[PDB]
């Protein structure tokens, strides 16, 4: 599924991400924009042979099982395929674990490089929330 901007903001809010670990909704929308372009089916292979999945490009190195990332963990206890669903529940639940692990949203290098410090409220500007 390719979400609209305000559509995704709504679904994130309903799943409890707004202000989760102190990160306003716009942070989460900005990260999804630059990670996936709001496409739940987004995948990207990393140099180490792990893969990033879904709207928030969650990595098989630590967070999900894809059967093809040697030595990896599955800390969200899900198949990585679950992160590709039109329903964002698994991605949001796993993102909450990730952002709680010590580094906040810096886990998402794209958030650090393209969202952190910017006017992230622009990402939810105009949305009925």
Kindly list the residues in this chain that would bind Na ion in the complex (CB under 5 A).
60, 65, 69, 72, 74
Annotated binding residues for substrate, written as ranges, equal 101
- Calpha distance 44→95 (Å, rounded): 17
101 vs 119 by CB, closer to Na ion: 101
Residue nearest to Cl ion as judged by C-beta position: 26
Q: Which of 1, 6, 11, 24 binds Cl ion (CB under 5 A)?
A: 24
Residue 79 forms beta bridges with which residues? 65
For the chain, first and last CA: distance in Å?
20
Is residue 66 part of the annotated active site? The answer reads no
For Na ion, the closer CB: 36 or 72:
72
Q: Which residues contact 14 (CB under 8 A, 6 or more apart)?
A: none
């Amino acid at each position: 599924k390719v979400f609209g901007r305000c559509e995704l903001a709504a679904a994130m809010k309903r799943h409890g991400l707004d202000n989760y670990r102190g990160y306003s909704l716009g942070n989460w929308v900005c990260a999804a924009k630059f990670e996936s372009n709001f496409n739940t089916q987004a995948t990207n292979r990393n140099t180490d042979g792990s893969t990033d999945y879904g709207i928030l490009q969650i990595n098989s190195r630590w967070w999900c099982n894809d059967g093809r990332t040697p030595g990896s963990r599955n800390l969200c206890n899900i198949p990585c395929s679950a992160l590709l669903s039109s329903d964002i529940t698994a991605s949001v639940n796993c993102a909450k674990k990730i952002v709680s692990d010590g580094n906040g949203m810096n886990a998402w290098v794209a958030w650090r490089n393209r969202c952190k410090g910017t006017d992230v409220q622009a990402w939810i500007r105009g949305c009925r929330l």
